[PDB]
Subunit: 353 residues, 4 copies
């Protein structure tokens, strides 16, 4: 196919624009042209309303066509390494270029994908916000996958994936998680119907876990190097032993009546909306404490590093001495005897009765 | 004292106004005058900024002087039957006229009151929003008392009060409630530190109970004619047998995993922010259902009378058939397969993902 | 008709209940019975889901049947003086008992009413939240009418009504208001399409005006004894001379670049969301000042009576000295140099940057 | 200095930790060690509470020490090219390494900086959220500067800066802007006290302008290739001719009574909280329309590409036909005759009366 055949095919499609429709085909024909004419690497046709695309420049490596109205894709160069067509109306994808490394098709209406484990170089897959009832088996080169907000009832098996690092499977219908891979670094699976978590204690690189909004009564022993744990809105009464590496913990909307000693490097603690009665001493590394909406009548001595204190909706008659770097103080709706002495660092303040 | 002595005393006080201060003493001197001159029943000096009052017209029956800046009151006619001085800066009250029937002194800085049980005609007492550490014994003529938002650690004994009908003691520090009077109709005691409620089952007129935001793990058997129960934000797993008269129930922010059959006249049910998994059938009299922020994946068949459905933040894939008079539909943030068919009655709608 | 015929007619209707439907006809048959049996004045059938009513007890004076599902009403006793059927599905009303004094039919689907000016004792009419495209002429005995939230394009003529005291005609499509009656005390007509107000200066009892959310560029001279004026969200640049009786003024969401001297008894001033640059001195009676979201860089000296200061979203580098009774301070999002010294009265505080 | 001298100096400082204080000096001594031991490029000591730093490894190029508590910095290697010490308590900076390219010191308490125009390789300067009353002259290599939220009354002269691309000077006290450089691509200066903008029409690369929340009555002729304009909350009645390249326009909170034809590629239009009466036809490329809180009674025909329609708080009796890809519909509080027919694309809906 010659330059002139491309150019001409592109002027045909541009005149094919649904007349009123708002499609910026001229703008699109200019980008194809310069792209063919500059023999660029990547073609950017984002947000031009296209309800379709013409034949693409051969040898392109990356197609950026998101935020259009595609229901179908044209044939793609076999040189293609990156496909970014999020925010379209695709209802299915066909098999893909064989060198694809990056698949982005989130915010589409996908109901099924091709056989992903045949694409030997897919590193990153994003099919967030589609209508997938199930996931195909995944290729072993996969490094990252986001499949949140679909309608998944099960996930593929994951433990054999040699390079999987992160999974987003939140907002689905999983009742169970598969055994996880040793390389996994993070798992985000909030809002599923997990009645339990798989075994975690043997995962030496798992650093982040989100399992908020599920059905947990209990947690397994944690990965020894866990750093951030979010299990907000579950039915937990107790926690397993917490790794000394933990630095972010969200236990809000559970059913704790107290918390025993937290690990000593914790920076952020969100334990709001529990039934907590008492706090004993806090880690001195703690910078943010949110215990809003609990049943406290006294707070423990405040960590010297604290910069954020959210203790709204409790029964406190008084705030303990505040740290010289407090930046945010929110202690609205407590039966407060007196105004604590506000440090000069405080730049955001709320107080009430 | 003559008209002229009154008039003159009132012009002295009016010239005594702190100069800039914004006090509307002229306005006040006109009301005293016409009041003396019309020999009115009641004197209205509300919201004129007075930092004080002069001698009052003799024989008045009611003084309305709220929303001023009084720290002290003048001597009051012994004819006085009603004293409304809410929203002032009083830090104590002296003994009162002996015919007082109505005492209103809420939104002041009271730290102690006189010996109330000596005032034989006090029917209604309001000392909400003061700084009372304790309540005096109450007169047996008391019909109503509101002492919410003080710093009460205990309440007077109440069971001997022959006409007590309603108590507001919410937002205090009660760890315990006294045995309640047989005549009591309503008790409002949210936000105290109740570890338990007194015996209720023998109270044949108790119709309303608010004990939200306390420390209850369990409830006593209820008054057989209970109509409204609010126990939001406690630690309840189960309820006692619910009276068939119950028509308003708030169990939000407790720890229910389900609810068995509700009484058949219930009109309003707020069970949001629990851990509910399933609902079996609902009372057909139900007009409002709030089960927001639970763990539902299916709703039960909807009552024909329902006009308000708040089912935001759950896992529903679909809304069941809606009743022909639904007026409000809020089902935002559910993994909703499809839009339910909205009845023409619906005037307030929210839907999302 | 005998007791037994009533009783029996009522048991027929009760068995006629749509089977599942949730209708509390038994409850309704008990109230009719005791009502007939006690020969009560008023019959209360509120909120029982009735989709209809049987024949009513003769000689009743008041019917309370609101919050049901009526599309039609039964014949009413000619003794009827009060009809409260708000919150039903009526799509029309027939002519009414001739002694009716109180008509309440708000929250229904009325598209037309009978000839109201023939009912010689109608004092109060409420047909708020219906679908009335026009109002019938009104009877001269009318004292109050609320016809807000209908679809009125015009109002009846009002100036001849000898006792009209208050009108709610807000949320309609009026492009114009009729000349108003001398007795009128209040007019609420927010959210219409008023391009102008009628002449007001000759109304000696008008005390309250709501005309927020219309199309005013200008206001007529005001009633000399005006006390509350709300003209929020119009296109005003200037105000007419303001009566010294004015005590509530809402000029928020207009286009003022400043305000000259306010009357000296003003208690509340809401001038938020204007383009105000400067405030000169304030009335010393002022208790609430809301000037949020303006273009201020300095506030004027604060009135001694002020209890509420809302000055959020401005450019202030500092708050002036606060009055010893300030109760509420909201001065969030101002480029604040320093924290003002908070008086011990302040019970609600917000500060930020 | 030898490895051992470093190591030892670092153990001295670590033992110097204020005892309780929460400072993670051990963690810091490990990073210095491995950094010296790996002879890394960059040293990362973020968020360890340090109230100080020991001597740094020589030849480092980048220091990341933000989110500590420094009031002072140690001497820095002259090899230093990047200094990231945001979120500390520095009250002044000394002269910097001479090869510095990146200066990050936002969220500190700076009151004055050294003589910036002597640092010949500073490309990026961020001193957002400090207390600078004035800016020093800038070096000609500057590419980006953010000095928002300080207390600047004037800016340095900018027009001579050969490579300046972007300026953030929002939230200051500027009454005037300097003439701008030909290379400038974006200017963010919301919330200052601009009474006017400099000449813009000769700026061929200016693409973005934020001047929301100032005092503009009028705008200069715009840069011919302008793409995004935000002038929310000013006093504009009219706009200059708008470039056909404009694609983002925010005129919310101004005083427009209408808008004539918008440029044909506009994607987003926020004209909420004006006084708009009518809209004539819209650009067919428009994807977001926000005209909330205006005075509309009819909308114009809706663009085929629209995905977001925010038309809350108007007087509409009906919504026109909705586009097949509408994703968001918010038309709450309009006197809506009927529910429009919702397209299957709509995933976020609000409707009300
Ligand atoms: Ca709780
Ligand atoms: Ca609570
Ligand atoms: Ca829960
Ligand atoms: Ca939840
Ligand atoms: Ca403004
Ligand atoms: Ca503003
Ligand atoms: Ca407006
Ligand atoms: Ca408005
Ligand atoms: Hg190309
Ligand atoms: Hg898009
Ligand atoms: Hg995009
Ligand atoms: Hg307490
Ligand atoms: Hg409390
Ligand atoms: Hg301290
Ligand atoms: Hg907060
Ligand atoms: Hg009197
Ligand atoms: Hg007041
Ligand atoms: Hg009051
Ligand atoms: Hg589900
Ligand atoms: Hg979900
Ligand atoms: Hg039905
Ligand atoms: Hg809601
Ligand atoms: Hg009766
Ligand atoms: Hg109702
Ligand atoms: Hg009602
Ligand atoms: Hg300023
Ligand atoms: Hg500002
Ligand atoms: Hg003062
Ligand atoms: Hg506020
Ligand atoms: Hg190093
Ligand atoms: Hg920090
Ligand atoms: Hg940071
Ligand atoms: Hg309208
Ligand atoms: Hg309206
Ligand atoms: Hg269409
Ligand atoms: Hg909205």
């Amino acid at each position: 196919k010659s330059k002139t055949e491309y150019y001409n095919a592109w002027s045909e499609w541009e005149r094919n624009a649904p007349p009123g429709n708002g499609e910026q085909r001229e703008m699109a024909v200019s980008r194809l042209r310069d792209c063919l004419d500059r023999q660029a690497h990547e073609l950017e046709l984002n947000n031009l309303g296209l309800s379709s695309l013409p034949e693409l420049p051969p040898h392109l490596e990356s197609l950026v066509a998101s935020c259009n109205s595609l229901t179908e894709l044209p044939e793609l160069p076999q040189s293609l390494k990156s496909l970014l067509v999020d925010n379209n109306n695709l209802k299915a994808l066909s098999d893909l270029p064989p060198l694809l490394e990056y698949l982005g098709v989130s915010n589409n209406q996908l109901e099924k994908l091709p056989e992903l484990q045949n694409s030997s170089f897919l590193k990153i897959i994003d099919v967030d916000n589609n209508s997938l009832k199930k996931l195909p088996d995944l290729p072993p080169s996969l490094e990252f996958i986001a499949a949140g907000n679909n309608q998944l009832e099960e996930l593929p098996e994951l433990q054999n994936l040699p390079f999987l690092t992160a999974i987003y499977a939140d907002n689905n219908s999983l009742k169970k998680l598969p055994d996880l891979p040793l390389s996994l670094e993070s798992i985000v699976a909030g809002n599923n119907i997990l009645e339990e978590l798989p075994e975690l204690q043997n995962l030496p690189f798992l650093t982040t876990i989100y399992a908020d909004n599920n059905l947990l009564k209990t947690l397994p022993d944690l990965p020894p190097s866990l750093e951030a744990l979010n299990v907000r809105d579950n039915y937990l009464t107790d926690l397993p032993e917490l790794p000394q590496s933990l630095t972010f913990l969200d236990v809000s909307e559970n059913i704790f009546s107290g918390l025993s000693e937290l690990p000593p490097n914790l920076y952020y603690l969100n334990a709001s909306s529990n039934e907590i009665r008492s706090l004993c001493d806090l880690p001195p590394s703690l910078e943010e404490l949110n215990v809003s909406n609990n049943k406290l009548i006294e707070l423990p001595a405040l960590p010297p590093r604290l910069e954020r204190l959210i203790a709204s909706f409790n029964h406190l008659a008084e705030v303990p001495e505040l740290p010289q770097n407090l930046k945010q103080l929110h202690v609205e709706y407590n039966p407060l005897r007196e105004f604590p002495d506000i440090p000069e660092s405080v730049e955001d303040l709320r107080m009430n009765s």
